[PDB]
Coordinates of C-alpha atoms and ligand atoms in Angstrom, one line a residue:
Chain T
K1 CA 53.0 111.2 110.2
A2 CA 52.1 114.9 110.6
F3 CA 54.7 117.6 110.3
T4 CA 55.4 119.4 113.6
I5 CA 57.7 122.1 115.0
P6 CA 59.1 121.8 118.6
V7 CA 57.7 124.4 121.0
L8 CA 60.5 126.7 122.0
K9 CA 61.1 130.3 123.0
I10 CA 63.8 132.2 121.2
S11 CA 65.9 132.0 124.4
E12 CA 65.7 128.2 124.4
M13 CA 67.1 127.9 120.9
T14 CA 70.6 126.9 120.0
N15 CA 72.6 128.3 117.2
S16 CA 73.4 125.7 114.6
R17 CA 76.6 127.4 113.4
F18 CA 78.3 128.0 116.7
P19 CA 77.6 126.2 120.0
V20 CA 75.8 129.1 121.9
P21 CA 72.2 130.0 122.4
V22 CA 70.3 132.1 119.9
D23 CA 70.1 135.8 121.0
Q24 CA 67.5 137.2 118.5
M25 CA 65.7 136.7 115.3
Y26 CA 67.1 138.9 112.6
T27 CA 66.3 139.8 109.0
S28 CA 68.6 141.2 106.3
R29 CA 68.6 142.2 102.7
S30 CA 72.0 140.4 102.3
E31 CA 73.3 143.0 99.9
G32 CA 76.4 141.8 98.2
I33 CA 76.3 138.5 100.2
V34 CA 75.8 134.9 99.2
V35 CA 74.0 133.0 102.0
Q36 CA 75.4 129.5 101.8
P37 CA 76.2 128.2 105.3
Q38 CA 77.0 124.5 105.6
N39 CA 76.1 124.0 109.2
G40 CA 72.5 124.1 110.3
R41 CA 71.4 122.7 106.9
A42 CA 68.5 120.2 107.0
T43 CA 65.4 119.7 104.9
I44 CA 62.1 119.8 106.7
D45 CA 61.5 116.1 105.9
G46 CA 64.7 115.2 107.7
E47 CA 67.7 115.2 105.3
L48 CA 70.9 116.7 106.7
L49 CA 73.0 118.7 104.3
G50 CA 76.4 120.2 104.1
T51 CA 78.5 119.6 107.2
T52 CA 75.5 119.5 109.5
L53 CA 75.5 117.1 112.5
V54 CA 72.8 116.6 115.1
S55 CA 74.9 117.1 118.2
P56 CA 74.4 120.6 119.4
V57 CA 77.7 121.0 121.3
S58 CA 79.9 119.9 118.4
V59 CA 79.9 122.5 115.7
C60 CA 83.3 124.3 115.3
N61 CA 85.1 121.6 117.5
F62 CA 88.1 119.7 116.2
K63 CA 89.7 116.4 117.4
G64 CA 92.8 114.7 116.2
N65 CA 96.4 113.7 116.9
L66 CA 99.0 116.4 117.5
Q67 CA 101.3 115.3 114.7
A68 CA 104.2 117.8 115.1
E69 CA 105.1 121.3 115.6
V70 CA 105.3 122.9 112.1
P71 CA 109.1 123.0 111.4
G72 CA 110.6 126.4 111.9
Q73 CA 107.3 127.9 113.2
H74 CA 107.4 127.6 116.9
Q75 CA 104.1 126.9 118.7
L76 CA 102.2 126.3 115.4
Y77 CA 101.0 122.7 115.7
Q78 CA 99.9 120.3 113.0
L79 CA 96.8 118.2 113.8
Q80 CA 95.8 115.0 112.0
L81 CA 92.1 115.2 112.4
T82 CA 89.6 112.5 113.1
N83 CA 85.9 113.0 113.0
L84 CA 84.3 114.4 116.1
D85 CA 82.8 110.9 116.9
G86 CA 86.3 109.3 116.7
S87 CA 85.9 107.7 113.2
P88 CA 88.8 108.5 110.8
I89 CA 88.5 111.3 108.4
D90 CA 87.3 109.9 105.0
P91 CA 87.8 112.5 102.3
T92 CA 85.7 110.3 99.9
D93 CA 82.6 111.3 101.9
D94 CA 80.0 113.2 100.0
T95 CA 80.4 116.3 102.2
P96 CA 82.3 119.6 101.8
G97 CA 84.3 118.7 104.9
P98 CA 84.1 116.9 108.3
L99 CA 80.8 117.3 110.1
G100 CA 80.7 120.3 112.4
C101 CA 83.6 122.0 110.5
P102 CA 83.4 125.8 110.6
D103 CA 81.6 127.2 107.6
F104 CA 83.2 130.7 107.8
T105 CA 86.7 132.3 107.4
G106 CA 88.3 134.0 110.4
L107 CA 90.5 133.6 113.4
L108 CA 88.7 131.0 115.5
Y109 CA 89.6 131.4 119.1
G110 CA 89.4 128.6 121.6
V111 CA 91.3 126.1 123.8
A112 CA 93.4 123.1 122.7
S113 CA 93.4 120.4 125.3
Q114 CA 95.2 117.1 125.6
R115 CA 94.9 114.0 127.7
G116 CA 97.9 111.7 127.7
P117 CA 100.2 109.9 128.3
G118 CA 98.0 108.2 130.8
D119 CA 95.7 110.7 132.6
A120 CA 98.1 113.7 132.4
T121 CA 96.2 116.6 131.0
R122 CA 97.0 120.1 129.7
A123 CA 95.1 122.9 128.0
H124 CA 95.9 126.3 126.6
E125 CA 94.3 129.0 124.5
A126 CA 94.7 128.4 120.7
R127 CA 93.7 130.0 117.4
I128 CA 92.8 128.3 114.1
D129 CA 92.8 130.4 110.9
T130 CA 90.1 128.9 108.8
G131 CA 91.1 131.3 106.1
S132 CA 94.8 130.2 105.9
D133 CA 96.2 128.4 102.8
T134 CA 96.9 125.2 104.7
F135 CA 93.5 125.0 106.5
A136 CA 92.3 121.7 104.8
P137 CA 89.9 119.9 107.1
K138 CA 88.5 117.8 104.3
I139 CA 91.7 115.8 104.3
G140 CA 92.3 116.2 108.0
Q141 CA 95.0 118.9 107.9
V142 CA 94.4 121.7 110.4
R143 CA 96.9 123.8 112.3
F144 CA 96.5 125.8 115.5
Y145 CA 98.7 128.4 117.1
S146 CA 99.1 128.8 120.8
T147 CA 101.0 131.2 123.1
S148 CA 101.9 128.1 125.1
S149 CA 104.6 125.5 124.2
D150 CA 103.2 123.0 126.7
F151 CA 101.8 120.5 124.2
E152 CA 103.0 116.9 123.6
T153 CA 103.3 115.3 120.2
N154 CA 101.3 112.1 119.5
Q155 CA 98.7 112.7 122.1
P156 CA 95.0 113.1 121.5
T157 CA 94.1 116.7 121.2
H158 CA 90.7 118.5 121.2
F159 CA 89.9 122.1 120.2
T160 CA 87.0 123.7 122.0
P161 CA 85.7 126.8 120.2
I162 CA 85.1 129.9 122.3
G163 CA 84.8 132.8 119.8
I164 CA 86.7 134.9 117.3
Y165 CA 89.9 136.9 117.4
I166 CA 90.0 140.2 115.5
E167 CA 93.5 141.3 114.4
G168 CA 92.3 144.1 112.1
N169 CA 93.5 142.7 108.8
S170 CA 92.7 140.3 105.9
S171 CA 92.1 137.4 108.3
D172 CA 89.0 139.2 109.8
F173 CA 85.8 137.2 110.5
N174 CA 83.5 136.9 107.5
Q175 CA 80.6 134.7 108.5
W176 CA 79.4 134.4 104.9
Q177 CA 82.8 133.4 103.3
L178 CA 83.1 129.7 103.1
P179 CA 86.5 128.2 103.8
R180 CA 88.4 126.2 101.3
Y181 CA 87.7 122.9 102.9
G182 CA 90.6 121.3 101.0
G183 CA 93.1 124.1 101.4
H184 CA 94.4 126.5 98.8
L185 CA 95.1 123.8 96.1
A186 CA 91.6 122.3 96.0
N187 CA 88.1 123.5 95.2
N188 CA 85.0 123.0 97.4
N189 CA 82.5 120.3 96.4
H190 CA 79.2 118.8 97.7
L191 CA 78.2 122.1 99.1
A192 CA 74.7 122.7 100.4
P193 CA 73.2 125.2 97.9
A194 CA 72.9 129.0 98.5
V195 CA 69.5 130.2 99.6
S196 CA 67.7 133.5 98.8
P197 CA 64.2 134.9 99.0
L198 CA 62.6 134.6 95.6
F199 CA 59.2 136.2 96.3
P200 CA 58.8 140.0 96.1
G201 CA 59.0 141.7 99.5
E202 CA 60.4 138.7 101.3
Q203 CA 63.7 138.3 103.1
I204 CA 65.3 135.4 104.9
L205 CA 64.6 135.3 108.6
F206 CA 67.8 134.4 110.5
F207 CA 68.5 133.2 114.1
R208 CA 71.3 135.4 115.3
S209 CA 73.9 134.9 118.1
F210 CA 76.5 137.4 119.2
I211 CA 79.5 135.0 119.8
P212 CA 82.4 136.0 122.1
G213 CA 85.3 138.0 120.8
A214 CA 88.8 137.4 122.2
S215 CA 90.4 140.7 121.1
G216 CA 89.8 143.6 118.8
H217 CA 86.4 145.0 117.7
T218 CA 83.5 142.8 116.6
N219 CA 79.8 142.2 117.4
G220 CA 80.4 138.5 116.7
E221 CA 77.2 138.2 114.6
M222 CA 76.6 134.6 113.5
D223 CA 73.3 134.0 111.7
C224 CA 71.9 130.5 111.2
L225 CA 69.0 129.4 109.0
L226 CA 67.4 127.0 111.6
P227 CA 68.0 126.6 115.3
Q228 CA 69.8 123.3 116.1
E229 CA 66.6 122.1 117.7
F230 CA 64.7 122.3 114.4
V231 CA 67.5 120.3 112.7
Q232 CA 67.4 117.7 115.4
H233 CA 63.6 117.6 115.2
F234 CA 63.3 117.1 111.5
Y235 CA 66.0 114.5 111.6
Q236 CA 64.0 112.6 114.2
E237 CA 60.6 113.0 112.6
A238 CA 61.4 112.8 108.8
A239 CA 57.8 113.8 108.2
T240 CA 56.5 114.0 104.7
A241 CA 56.5 117.5 103.2
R242 CA 53.0 117.9 101.7
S243 CA 54.0 121.1 99.9
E244 CA 57.1 123.1 99.2
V245 CA 56.3 125.6 102.0
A246 CA 55.2 125.1 105.6
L247 CA 53.3 128.1 106.9
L248 CA 54.4 129.0 110.4
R249 CA 52.7 131.3 112.9
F250 CA 54.6 133.0 115.6
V251 CA 52.1 132.7 118.5
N252 CA 51.8 135.0 121.5
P253 CA 50.6 132.5 124.1
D254 CA 49.2 135.3 126.3
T255 CA 46.5 136.0 123.6
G256 CA 46.6 132.9 121.4
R257 CA 46.8 135.2 118.3
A258 CA 49.5 135.5 115.7
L259 CA 52.4 138.0 116.2
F260 CA 53.5 137.3 112.6
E261 CA 53.7 134.5 110.0
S262 CA 56.7 133.0 108.3
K263 CA 57.3 130.7 105.4
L264 CA 59.4 127.6 106.2
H265 CA 60.7 126.4 102.9
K266 CA 61.1 122.6 102.5
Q267 CA 64.9 122.9 101.8
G268 CA 65.3 124.3 105.3
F269 CA 65.1 128.1 105.7
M270 CA 62.5 130.7 106.6
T271 CA 61.3 133.9 104.9
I272 CA 59.2 136.7 106.1
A273 CA 57.6 139.8 104.6
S274 CA 60.1 142.5 105.6
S275 CA 62.6 145.0 104.3
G276 CA 66.0 146.0 105.6
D277 CA 68.5 144.9 108.2
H278 CA 67.1 144.8 111.7
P279 CA 66.2 142.4 114.5
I280 CA 62.7 140.9 114.9
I281 CA 62.0 141.4 118.6
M282 CA 58.9 139.8 120.0
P283 CA 57.3 139.1 123.4
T284 CA 59.7 136.6 125.0
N285 CA 57.2 133.8 125.3
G286 CA 56.4 133.7 121.6
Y287 CA 57.0 130.5 119.7
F288 CA 56.5 129.2 116.2
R289 CA 53.7 126.8 115.5
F290 CA 53.0 124.9 112.3
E291 CA 49.8 126.3 110.6
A292 CA 49.3 124.8 107.1
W293 CA 50.9 123.6 103.9
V294 CA 51.0 126.4 101.3
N295 CA 52.9 127.3 98.1
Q296 CA 55.7 129.7 97.3
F297 CA 53.2 132.3 96.2
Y298 CA 51.6 132.7 99.6
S299 CA 51.4 136.3 100.7
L300 CA 52.6 137.1 104.2
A301 CA 51.6 140.1 106.3
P302 CA 54.7 142.2 106.9
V303 CA 56.5 142.2 110.2
Chain N
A1 CA 52.1 108.0 123.3
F2 CA 55.6 107.6 124.9
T3 CA 58.7 107.7 122.7
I4 CA 62.5 107.9 123.1
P5 CA 64.5 110.0 120.6
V6 CA 66.4 107.7 118.2
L7 CA 70.1 108.5 119.0
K8 CA 73.5 106.8 119.0
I9 CA 75.6 107.1 122.1
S10 CA 78.0 109.5 120.1
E11 CA 75.0 111.7 119.2
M12 CA 74.0 112.3 122.8
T13 CA 74.9 115.3 124.9
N14 CA 76.0 115.2 128.5
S15 CA 73.4 117.0 130.6
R16 CA 76.0 118.0 133.3
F17 CA 78.6 119.4 131.0
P18 CA 78.3 120.7 127.4
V19 CA 80.2 117.9 125.6
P20 CA 79.0 114.7 123.8
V21 CA 78.5 111.5 125.7
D22 CA 81.5 109.1 125.4
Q23 CA 80.1 105.9 126.7
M24 CA 77.4 104.2 128.8
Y25 CA 78.8 103.3 132.2
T26 CA 77.5 101.5 135.3
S27 CA 78.8 101.4 138.9
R28 CA 77.9 100.2 142.4
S29 CA 78.4 103.7 143.7
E30 CA 79.2 102.3 147.2
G31 CA 79.4 105.0 149.8
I32 CA 78.4 107.6 147.3
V33 CA 75.3 109.8 147.3
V34 CA 74.3 110.2 143.6
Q35 CA 72.4 113.5 143.6
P36 CA 73.3 115.6 140.5
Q37 CA 71.2 118.7 140.0
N38 CA 71.6 119.1 136.2
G39 CA 70.1 116.6 133.8
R40 CA 67.2 116.0 136.2
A41 CA 63.8 115.6 134.6
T42 CA 60.8 113.4 135.1
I43 CA 59.7 111.4 132.1
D44 CA 56.5 113.5 131.9
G45 CA 58.7 116.5 131.5
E46 CA 59.0 118.3 134.8
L47 CA 62.5 119.7 135.1
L48 CA 64.1 119.3 138.6
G49 CA 67.1 120.8 140.4
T50 CA 68.9 123.3 138.3
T51 CA 68.0 121.6 134.9
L52 CA 67.5 123.8 131.9
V53 CA 66.6 122.7 128.3
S54 CA 69.4 124.4 126.4
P55 CA 72.2 121.9 125.7
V56 CA 75.0 124.4 125.5
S57 CA 74.3 126.4 128.7
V58 CA 75.1 124.1 131.6
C59 CA 78.2 125.3 133.6
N60 CA 78.1 128.7 131.9
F61 CA 77.9 132.0 133.9
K62 CA 77.2 135.5 132.9
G63 CA 76.8 138.9 134.6
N64 CA 78.5 142.1 135.4
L65 CA 82.2 142.3 136.2
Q66 CA 81.5 144.1 139.5
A67 CA 85.1 144.7 140.7
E68 CA 88.6 143.3 141.0
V69 CA 88.4 141.8 144.5
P70 CA 90.2 144.2 146.8
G71 CA 93.4 142.6 148.2
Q72 CA 93.3 139.6 146.0
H73 CA 95.5 139.0 143.1
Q74 CA 93.6 138.9 139.7
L75 CA 90.4 137.8 141.3
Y76 CA 87.2 139.2 139.7
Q77 CA 83.8 139.5 141.3
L78 CA 80.9 138.6 139.0
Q79 CA 77.3 139.7 139.8
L80 CA 75.4 137.0 138.0
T81 CA 72.3 137.2 136.0
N82 CA 70.4 134.1 134.9
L83 CA 71.7 132.7 131.7
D84 CA 68.6 134.0 129.9
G85 CA 69.5 137.5 131.1
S86 CA 66.8 137.8 133.7
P87 CA 67.8 138.8 137.3
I88 CA 68.8 136.2 139.9
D89 CA 65.9 135.6 142.2
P90 CA 67.2 133.8 145.4
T91 CA 63.6 133.0 146.4
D92 CA 63.1 130.7 143.4
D93 CA 62.5 127.1 144.3
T94 CA 65.8 125.9 142.9
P95 CA 69.1 125.2 144.7
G96 CA 70.7 127.8 142.5
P97 CA 70.4 129.4 139.1
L98 CA 69.6 127.1 136.2
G99 CA 72.7 125.6 134.6
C100 CA 74.9 126.1 137.6
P101 CA 77.6 123.4 138.0
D102 CA 76.5 120.7 140.4
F103 CA 80.0 119.4 141.3
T104 CA 82.9 120.7 143.4
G105 CA 86.1 121.4 141.6
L106 CA 88.3 123.9 139.8
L107 CA 86.2 124.6 136.8
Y108 CA 88.4 125.8 133.9
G109 CA 87.3 127.9 131.0
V110 CA 87.3 131.3 129.3
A111 CA 85.9 134.6 130.6
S112 CA 85.0 137.0 127.8
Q113 CA 83.7 140.5 127.7
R114 CA 82.1 142.8 125.1
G115 CA 82.2 146.5 125.9
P116 CA 82.6 149.4 125.9
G117 CA 81.0 149.4 122.4
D118 CA 82.1 146.4 120.4
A119 CA 85.6 146.2 122.0
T120 CA 86.1 142.5 123.1
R121 CA 88.6 140.5 125.1
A122 CA 88.7 136.9 126.5
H123 CA 91.2 135.0 128.7
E124 CA 91.4 131.7 130.5
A125 CA 89.7 131.7 133.8
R126 CA 88.9 129.3 136.6
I127 CA 86.2 129.2 139.3
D128 CA 86.6 127.1 142.4
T129 CA 83.1 125.8 143.0
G130 CA 84.1 124.6 146.5
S131 CA 85.3 128.1 147.6
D132 CA 83.3 129.7 150.4
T133 CA 82.8 132.7 148.1
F134 CA 81.0 130.6 145.5
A135 CA 77.4 131.6 146.1
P136 CA 75.6 131.6 142.7
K137 CA 72.2 131.3 144.5
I138 CA 72.5 134.9 145.4
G139 CA 74.5 135.7 142.2
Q140 CA 78.0 136.0 143.7
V141 CA 80.8 134.1 141.9
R142 CA 84.5 134.9 141.6
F143 CA 86.9 133.8 138.9
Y144 CA 90.7 133.8 138.7
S145 CA 92.6 134.7 135.6
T146 CA 96.3 135.1 134.9
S147 CA 95.4 138.1 132.8
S148 CA 94.6 141.6 134.2
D149 CA 92.9 142.5 130.9
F150 CA 89.3 142.8 132.2
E151 CA 87.2 145.9 132.3
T152 CA 85.1 146.6 135.4
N153 CA 81.3 147.1 134.8
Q154 CA 81.2 145.3 131.4
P155 CA 79.1 142.3 130.5
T156 CA 81.1 139.2 131.1
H157 CA 80.6 135.5 130.1
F158 CA 82.2 132.4 131.5
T159 CA 82.4 129.6 128.9
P160 CA 83.3 126.2 130.5
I161 CA 85.9 124.0 129.0
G162 CA 87.1 121.5 131.6
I163 CA 88.6 120.9 135.0
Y164 CA 91.9 122.0 136.5
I165 CA 93.7 119.8 139.0
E166 CA 96.1 121.6 141.4
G167 CA 97.1 121.0 145.0
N168 CA 95.8 124.3 146.4
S169 CA 92.3 124.1 145.0
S170 CA 89.5 121.6 145.6
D171 CA 89.9 118.3 143.7
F172 CA 87.2 117.4 141.1
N173 CA 84.5 115.4 143.0
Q174 CA 81.6 115.0 140.6
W175 CA 79.2 113.8 143.3
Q176 CA 79.9 116.5 145.9
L177 CA 77.4 119.3 145.5
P178 CA 78.5 122.9 145.9
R179 CA 77.1 125.0 148.7
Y180 CA 75.0 127.0 146.2
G181 CA 74.4 129.7 148.8
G182 CA 77.9 130.2 150.1
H183 CA 79.7 129.1 153.3
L184 CA 76.9 129.1 155.8
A185 CA 73.8 128.3 153.8
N186 CA 72.4 124.8 153.6
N187 CA 71.3 123.7 150.1
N188 CA 67.6 123.6 149.5
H189 CA 65.1 122.5 146.8
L190 CA 67.5 119.8 145.6
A191 CA 66.5 117.1 143.2
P192 CA 66.6 113.9 145.3
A193 CA 69.3 111.4 145.4
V194 CA 68.9 108.2 143.3
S195 CA 69.8 104.6 143.8
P196 CA 68.8 101.2 142.4
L197 CA 66.2 99.6 144.6
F198 CA 65.7 96.2 143.0
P199 CA 68.3 93.6 143.8
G200 CA 71.0 93.0 141.2
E201 CA 70.4 96.3 139.5
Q202 CA 72.8 99.3 139.1
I203 CA 72.2 102.8 137.7
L204 CA 73.2 103.2 134.1
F205 CA 75.2 106.4 133.6
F206 CA 76.0 108.3 130.4
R207 CA 79.7 109.2 130.9
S208 CA 81.8 111.9 129.3
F209 CA 85.6 112.4 129.7
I210 CA 85.7 116.2 130.0
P211 CA 88.9 118.0 129.2
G212 CA 91.6 118.6 131.8
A213 CA 93.6 121.8 131.9
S214 CA 96.3 120.6 134.3
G215 CA 97.2 117.7 136.5
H216 CA 96.1 114.1 136.3
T217 CA 92.4 113.4 135.8
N218 CA 90.2 111.3 133.6
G219 CA 87.6 114.0 133.7
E220 CA 84.8 111.5 134.4
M221 CA 81.4 113.2 134.4
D222 CA 78.3 110.9 134.7
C223 CA 74.8 112.1 134.0
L224 CA 71.6 110.2 134.6
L225 CA 69.8 111.2 131.3
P226 CA 71.4 112.6 128.1
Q227 CA 70.3 116.2 127.5
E228 CA 68.2 115.1 124.5
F229 CA 66.1 112.9 126.7
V230 CA 65.5 115.9 128.9
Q231 CA 64.5 118.1 126.0
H232 CA 62.2 115.4 124.5
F233 CA 60.4 114.7 127.8
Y234 CA 59.9 118.5 128.2
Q235 CA 58.5 118.7 124.7
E236 CA 56.1 115.7 125.0
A237 CA 54.7 116.2 128.6
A238 CA 53.5 112.6 128.2
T239 CA 51.8 110.9 131.1
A240 CA 53.7 108.1 132.7
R241 CA 51.3 105.2 132.7
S242 CA 53.4 103.4 135.3
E243 CA 56.4 104.0 137.5
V244 CA 58.9 102.5 135.0
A245 CA 59.3 102.8 131.2
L246 CA 60.9 99.6 129.9
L247 CA 63.5 100.4 127.3
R248 CA 65.3 98.0 124.9
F249 CA 68.8 98.7 123.3
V250 CA 68.8 97.5 119.7
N251 CA 71.3 97.4 116.9
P252 CA 69.5 98.6 113.7
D253 CA 72.2 97.1 111.4
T254 CA 71.2 93.6 112.4
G255 CA 67.9 93.9 114.3
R256 CA 69.6 92.3 117.3
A257 CA 68.3 93.5 120.6
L258 CA 71.2 93.7 123.1
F259 CA 69.8 94.5 126.6
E260 CA 66.9 96.1 128.4
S261 CA 66.9 98.9 130.9
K262 CA 64.3 100.4 133.4
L263 CA 63.7 104.1 132.9
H264 CA 62.2 105.2 136.2
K265 CA 59.5 107.9 136.2
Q266 CA 61.6 110.3 138.3
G267 CA 64.4 110.3 135.7
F268 CA 67.1 107.7 135.7
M269 CA 67.8 104.3 134.3
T270 CA 68.9 101.0 135.8
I271 CA 70.2 97.8 134.3
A272 CA 70.9 94.3 135.8
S273 CA 74.7 94.5 136.2
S274 CA 77.4 94.1 138.8
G275 CA 80.6 96.1 139.2
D276 CA 82.1 99.4 137.9
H277 CA 82.6 99.0 134.2
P278 CA 81.6 100.6 130.9
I279 CA 78.7 99.1 128.9
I280 CA 80.2 98.7 125.4
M281 CA 77.7 98.2 122.6
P282 CA 77.6 98.3 118.8
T283 CA 78.2 101.9 117.6
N284 CA 74.8 102.3 115.9
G285 CA 72.7 100.9 118.8
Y286 CA 70.0 103.0 120.4
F287 CA 67.2 102.7 123.1
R288 CA 63.6 102.2 122.2
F289 CA 60.5 102.3 124.4
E290 CA 58.8 98.9 124.8
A291 CA 56.3 98.8 127.7
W292 CA 55.1 100.3 130.9
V293 CA 56.3 98.1 133.8
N294 CA 56.8 98.5 137.5
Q295 CA 59.9 98.8 139.7
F296 CA 60.0 95.0 140.2
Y297 CA 60.4 94.0 136.5
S298 CA 63.4 91.6 136.4
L299 CA 66.0 92.3 133.7
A300 CA 68.5 89.8 132.2
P301 CA 72.1 90.8 133.1
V302 CA 74.3 92.8 130.8
Ligands
CL401 CL1 66.1 108.8 112.6
CL402 CL1 56.4 122.9 126.8

């Protein structure tokens, strides 16, 4: 079975780290930054890594029982998580945390909804601090705060992510700081490895989204390594990787010729020949196409 | 030539609302016109109605916060763009802009803005898709919010979350199409209604229970094709060798095949069944293409 890429414009791609469309391609030097996201992690021969799931609407969602209001802390609610598909959290799993769990620290803004008893429903805005000491999704312990007290204990509860809340303090959004999946008394394990460009003059090519902000000042930048459609496609195809690097061409369909070329590394990230922090803006109908198997030494024309 | 993506039910996305599929479901749909406009694609990849390929975009809106509606209390006038940023073209051969809700109800979600600069703000919001002001085809939609914290003339996005049941707004009717053009306009360029034609068969739906924000509702939202089937058919552009693709639902744990279904060329599935009930199957089961048949192929009941 031959390796293939799905044919997609940038505007048809889905961010694999937050359930919103990709806005632009982006490259960065990543000065002082360790790139180690756990969502959107898949090898090109079909192995999912980190907390990556294939569903494109599920990343950064939570589901669970509303166990209780945290004693003494009004309108702070303790969830007992399940997995997003309904199966119980199993902390013996070989994952950093539950599939789809946020891979960044910050004030995640969204809506907590309930259905029950019966068909009675209710929903209100909520905030989950993925940087807080007790944020421990690996063992199913997550809390959310809400300005509403209209939540019932022991009813099924879902958290739909919307964006990030900026208070202007230590809790501020850091898309490259992994949470402590087990809370403040446990260390992360089974992480997908960090990635970096190893070849001179190359930088990682990211797929960037500007996610919504709920207060304060932020551009909401969320950079993933692969659009969710590439994850889904490699998962489906599980094609044999004939070399360590798949050479991609970003094709202008109006001319048939290359706009630029990129190296898709087998472990699931792309590099380009570029320098600095800036978007990669192209004609809107451009798409990546698989060109050939090459090695890590292949020299790319700069873009 | 023709393939179906290998997906469990829990890995499928509802094509009419951006949530995972909860179950397969079948119904007689007596006295109901089944004519959803999202999740509509032929098996050779032609998108119909308002169907787009992005799985996170259906029921989203974006555009300029034109004004607080004069007279009204905390009503905001959106001037839509298309979800890809391009301008709304009312002469397009669609009933409305791609991704537009295809049901009438009080759609609940969060309206967010960014601007001026990187200043941001977001608050709960709801859009009555049955209101006579709801006219997305010409880019006019209003939302209500308990908050007054919205800047005029800043980019605004509506992220859908669920449905809101209250007496003084339209109840959630998933099979009642909005008037995409506002009060007086007739809908046009609609994907057609679907129904089983062979005796003993019913449509097979992929059902989600979308969140409720208030009131009593089971949030039932039935689509004809999971969004991943839509994306796959769009990618493949494979020629339909007959009018029906015969599919088989199989459990990979045991190799047991559980039932067969008829995937009609124009983009929906039927099974031999009777009554309104979920189709509960082993968790790891999935559909697989078996053969090109016609509309008269007779299935064993499930
Ligand atoms: Cl597979
Ligand atoms: Cl195409």
